[PDB]
Paper text:
Flaviviruses are positive-strand RNA viruses with enveloped virus particles. The C-terminal domain forms a stem consisting of three membrane-proximal helices (E-H1, E-H2 and E-H3) and two transmembrane helices (E-T1 and E-T2).
To confirm the structural mimicry of the chimeric viruses at the atomic level we determined the cryo-EM reconstructions of wild-type WNVKUN (Kunjin strain—KUN), which can be handled in BSL2 equivalent cryo-EM facilities, and the chimeric counterpart BinJV-WNVKUN (bWNVKUN). Alignment of the six molecules in the asymmetric unit as a block (3 × M, 3 × E) showed a very close match between the models with an overall root-mean-squared deviation (RMSD) of 0.681 Å for all atoms of 1719 equivalent residues in the final refined structures. In bMVEV and bWNVKUN, Lys16 from M forms a salt bridge with Asp28 from the opposing E subunit, thus stabilizing the dimer formation. Re-examination of the WNVKUN, bWNVKUN and bMVEV maps, as well as deposited reconstructions of TBEV and ZIKV revealed unaccounted densities of similar shapes and volumes to the bDENV-2 map.
Author numbering:
A (entry chain a), C (entry chain b), F (entry chain c): 5 to 75
B (entry chain A), D (entry chain B), E (entry chain C): 1 to 501
Write the structure that this text describes.
């Protein structure tokens, strides 16, 4: 569990601000790269579960985000 | 100390009917108060310093395992229990292992195993709490007087000239009257006990560097921890690995140093300075009320300088719409005021821009006296005229921007301050209006609800949820729920982008 | 990213097999306890997104899983 | 060595007239082949050992930062460039800092800086690939002959009696013919080149421990890495933290040791032995074919003994349906058969249970000769009768379980073997056949598709996805997609539960 | 060692031609086997002893508490940890207490305390397991030969006459051929390993009284427990009471002796004899097969006694439908058979009742020879005639009851045996019929589910569920579920009433 | 938790066979006798919860048994 953005009105830099954008993305990126076959599974399951276009898109995004970060 | 040369600088205007101003002094930020017929002052908190830190809990990130012993048990019997389990500082684990007539056993099955090892911590990360009675802020007030480029940042010169002062703001002494000779005196009424919410942070020292971490995050670390002034460690099974069940000797090794895993976990923590059981923090905020009624303008009894001035260099923009320039006075007329002004053209000659250094004058009586002056020219082309007649010098200046762009930057900075301070941002620049109080109460309740709902999220979760809520609001049949979802999605997207990540 | 279950057909235990159950759940459970108020948000968003009970349940679960593990 | 005392033990009964059988020798597992008119043998691989490991990539988990230097530039002098950009082993980072007349500049703005620091690695995590021409499986073959409880697991005694032998299976010598004393000879046509896929694993050494990591997981590691036998470190910014940008000297510190963070990342890796540049693996599988043409039964010409036996100790259930006991002959007949059988009652005396130690006999001619005999009693109550007449000894034995429970356990173990071996599981206990080949091909294509779809998942994601697919299948209108979803969800749930986590 | 004088007695009429019969020797019971042309034998197991018991777990029911020490902590300072937080001989508890300036604290609130006490057990209840190789039943076989009142129950006299014998039935010797004087030999083939399910009980010793308790009940005792080899105690907080949280000294006292609560919890447990690490119990059953092919009559070459007999005392009804009387022979004819018969009238003199003492004779040659004879008169009025002519003595006897009431008592005892033994009850008096095996298989299949459904229920819950299921079946619509509920409720009500509670 | 009826096929008495009938009734009887007011509550709730006479009787009995033995 990472610390995350502090609440102490900091106009300066935190401990690791260089990785502040990629810290919550490197795992998902490296997982989807080596495991590209899931992108089709998530798309199919989202298309078959959503009755609307918005529902299908949200299902696909949620599945493609939950698979790398297993919980 | 002073606002000159700081990217974070705000300008508050003094109301003619108000005797005090309410401002939130943020760390690494500076506030400039400009009032009519009063000297300009710079109020800036330097740091928050709390001594006598009390140790709370020390996590271990580098353990040592030795004195291994294993005791086996026959299947269809009770569980195995090693004799070293009675001795303290020993971590034991139960497991199953294959037993039979080859292992000297009597039955075939999964026999019970019991392996113990001595747990010894090498380096630990101590977490300390901040007692709200030991905190003290260092606030610095600087009145814009006669300064040079060298002496502007020199605190010794400004203290000797009685134009600045660093003073401690404690809960037991929340008010301080800074005597500025011939400039009157300024009084600040600050709220030290409510400035930085020290009850929500721990002072964690990981090796040689110290951080300011959340309490909920610190109590969720899965590491061997011990209480204050205690050598008994708990949750010691994390830093130990039981390799494989063996009937005679199961191997137990300690994991590597978790010092790097801690540094990776302290991603958003704020690094602080810790020495002599005292933590120094240059971040945070401090709500103060600046009393400026007894603040009198110095140099109002001097005459205008009669000799010629010169620009010691090209005037420089500060990025905050102001211009700083250094003049040099040739004459020896003693203390004399400088006839410097910003005009729109060399034929109008009427003042159009405001001077930040109100009533500038040459302090010393010797020749070649350097004076630093800060002005605020209008947007567009203007001229910085010094003197009159044949000794008049002027410098053309172009100020890029407009009042509309300035208003956009101002409202963006206000939104960022509201996102960074919460309800405390309504007390910035306030003079006690009824609108500010209602706004602060509404922000208090709405922010309490908003934090209770969407607290603990990162900028990615906040951004995704805000986009989803906007998509749900634009596709909502009703009007009320649609506007609510739009507002929540907008504030979530703003909080996501405000991190700049 | 953690290594995960190997493919060598091992009948003994892996490196960290005692934590094989709570390996991917310590973060999510600890995040839920600290932030209970999100469970209401995820529930109402799933309810307003899904048109069927199955869609609502899946939306709620996917949101409640994707919030703690931000990736 | 032998199968006695092994928790993982499978029994394969070859059909009459069969001369060979395909096996999949798994690590820490033992297979027992029982053929009619042939002695019972125990085949198992002990360890796979590979030497001359070639290094591929070496990561760094403990770095050192030294030789700090910072080059600053004014807001209008462009970007700062430090003279350490041309020096390798120096990591440099460009940043911005607020400059002004106080810092020593002439203008006000975000001045560019370029801080460099020397990167030096102190401890590395070296990964090494496995050359397929250097692997060798150690296989042990043990034939069930006259043994005692003390000498059943003694490899030296079983080799002096020519009843067992350890041998290596190399890709250069994939066949070995073990010559037994009077049991004939047994030969194994193993396939060591296709046993363990060495092209998908690296041998990573993190400090004092060594692991068999995945090849793709090792390359995606976010740490400073250098190629084989090279000191050129790349991706060095991960172990270095650049602190708050300062004008004259920005501090750069190296993160803590990432050894513990690596041990945590190696959660599902397989620990292996590593010494003298060779690696030993007790886990894994080895597809092999045991040919038992020259395997003959010893002692078929001996005469049945006449004296009385006795039970030394109680028989013990091995845990796989078989029962092992030790007899003691009281005569001096010499080489003589043992009239031991498993009957349902003392009236019929019809053999109901088979013998694992087929054709048991007393080898030595001394007075008290201990013999270890392993039977396979029927379910329920039975008797182990040794001898006939007035010298026979009976031992009652109750075998708990049922034939239906045996079928359920066999189906569960077959499913677990299919999940752990994939298409190789069809080669287990295979004597050919059209069903086996088509089943293995269908499993090959289905497992290829299944891995390409749900390869890098944990048991939690697999379980949730299987539950979702089952819920979609029970609510599917079309029967085809319903059956497909039900099958895939069942496979996913089985793989999620098979890990027992 | 014989059946005379036992409330539990079974009579089995051997079919002519069959050489054996299956018995289920229940403890405190007795089986009388009568054949057409063979002497009558009594078979019963006297006890079941098992030596070399292994300790599995020892519970403490009387603990001692001393060395009280409390460590207090200020509010918002984390939970306190006492100095004696070590593993050995110390139990600790966390509590809160009011702190303030009066208690010597700095803040007001619920300060945390941690008090520890020295735990020491005084008397413990040791539980031991039974190794299935050390069990040995004591079966006694008695042959109805010439006995008297004083000699029928004397074991020394019956062994001197070679008419009775006590022998051990071990798993290593489940068969015993008891040799008799001139009655031949009786051979029993018992099943000691599956007689008493020793794998489901523990030998629990509470003080001086020892019990045979269930395994699952013994492991669910909420009491401080330790392992066998002098282990430390666990779950020790159940016998310790932390009275009231105090700032400086929280009092901790140990509860009273839990020996009474143990005896009250061992309600349905079975008391056993325990001494010298050996447990002996009289209850339980033992499935055995008695072979009587070599059992012959003694005294068939004798002639009928010529002199007259006399009734010593009155005949007595044993309560099992048989009648035992005493005769005193007045002659010195030596070994001569007794002409005794049970007739319906004194003018028919046709044998109507069956003699239990088959072929009675006067063994000794003295003047007055007492002899015990057992008969089975018909229901109603009958005469016991000894001799004929002038020497004839008659004794009227009335046998109450009828053949219908006898059948009712027989089916009641059969249902009770089925409820007490389960599937083992089908092997009582079984000669190997097809109906017996089918019935036993169906009973196994039904009883498995019945135990899985209503295993740990008392006679009250069983009776309530039986009544509820009968009510549901009566009010049911479908004829299948109605009869199912009827059958299940009837079985439950019978099991509830069978406890006689 | 008391031991309960053994499974050893015993024909003599157990440890405490004299209390075999009152061991599971002393608590409920004494509880019902010290507060008979609950008997009205159980009867009313069973009458207002069951639609048939059998359902009312079973509800009444189950409540009147659950109240004394709180577990
Ligand atoms: C301030 O000026 C004094 C001389 O008046 C000098 O000694 C001192 O070093 C200056 N301080 C700084 C920070 O430049
Ligand atoms: C094997 O047997 C030999 C000879 O009896 C003995 O010297 C040796 O110690 C035995 N080894 C083991 C492992 O039992
Ligand atoms: C059995 O008979 C012998 C010899 O008459 C006598 O000594 C012994 O006391 C008798 N035993 C019993 C139990 O009556």
């Amino acid at each position: 569990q990472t610390h995350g953005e502090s609440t102490l009105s900091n106009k300066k830099g935190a401990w690791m601000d260089s990785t502040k954008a990629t810290r919550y993305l490197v795992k998902t990126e490296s997982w989807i790269l080596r495991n590209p076959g899931y992108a089709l599974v998530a798309a199919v399951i989202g298309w078959m579960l959503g009755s609307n276009t918005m529902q299908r898109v949200v299902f696909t995004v949620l599945l493609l985000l939950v698979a790398p970060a297993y919980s | 100390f002073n606002c000159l040369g700081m990217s974070n600088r705000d300008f508050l205007e003094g109301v003619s009917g108000a005797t005090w101003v309410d401002l939130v002094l943020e760390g690494d930020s500076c506030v400039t108060i400009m009032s009519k017929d009063k000297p300009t002052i710079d109020v800036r908190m330097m740091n928050m310093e709390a001594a006598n830190l009390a140790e709370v809990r020390s996590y271990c990130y580098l353990a040592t395992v030795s004195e291994l012993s294993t005791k086996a048990a026959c299947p269809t019997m009770g569980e195995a229990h090693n004799d070293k389990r009675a001795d303290p500082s020993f971590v034991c684990k139960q497991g199953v292992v294959d037993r039979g007539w080859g292992n000297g056993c009597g039955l075939f099955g999964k026999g019970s195993i019991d392996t113990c090892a001595k747990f010894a911590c090498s380096t630990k990360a101590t977490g300390r709490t901040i007692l709200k009675e030991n905190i003290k802020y260092e606030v610095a007030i600087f009145v814009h007087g006669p300064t040079t480029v060298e002496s502007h940042g020199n605190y010794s010169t400004q203290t000797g000239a009685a134009q600045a002062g660093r003073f401690s703001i404690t809960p037991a002494a929340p008010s301080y009257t800074l005597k500025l000779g011939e400039y009157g005196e300024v009084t600040v009424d600050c709220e030290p006990r409510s400035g930085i919410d020290t009850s929500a942070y721990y002072v964690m020292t990981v090796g040689t560097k110290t951080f300011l971490v959340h309490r909920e995050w610190f109590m969720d670390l899965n590491l061997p921890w011990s209480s204050a002034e205690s050598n008994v460690w708990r949750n010691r099974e994390t830093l130990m690995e039981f390799e494989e069940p063996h009937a005679t000797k199961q191997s137990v090794i300690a994991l590597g140093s978790q010092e790097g895993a801690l540094h990776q976990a302290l991603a958003g923590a704020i690094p602080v300075e810790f020495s002599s059981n005292t933590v120094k923090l240059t971040s945070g905020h401090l709500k103060c009320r600046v009393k400026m009624e007894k603040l009198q303008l110095k140099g109002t009894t001097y005459g205008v300088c009669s000799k010629a001035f010169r620009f010691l260099g090209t005037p420089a923009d500060t990025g905050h719409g102001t211009v700083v320039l250094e003049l040099q006075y040739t004459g020896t007329d003693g203390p004399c005021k400088i006839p410097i002004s910003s005009v729109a053209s060399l034929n109008d000659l009427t003042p159009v821009g405001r001077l930040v250094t109100v009533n500038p004058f040459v302090s010393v009586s010797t020749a070649n006296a350097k004076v630093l002056i800060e002005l605020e020219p209008p947007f567009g082309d203007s001229y910085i005229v010094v003197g009159r007649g044949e000794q008049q010098i002027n410098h053309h200046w172009h100020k890029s921007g407009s009042s509309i762009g300035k208003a956009f930057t101002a409202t963006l900075k206000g939104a960022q301050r509201l996102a960074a301070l919460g309800d405390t941002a309504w007390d910035f620049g306030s003079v006690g209006g009824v609108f500010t109080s209602v706004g602060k109460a509404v922000h208090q309740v709405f922010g309490g609800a908003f934090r209770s709902l969407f607290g603990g999220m990162s900028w990615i979760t906040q951004g995704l949820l805000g986009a989803l809520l906007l998509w749900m609001g634009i596709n909502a049949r009703d009007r009320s729920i649609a506007f609510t979802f739009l507002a929540v999605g907008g504030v979530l997207l703003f909080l996501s982008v405000n991190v700049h990540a």
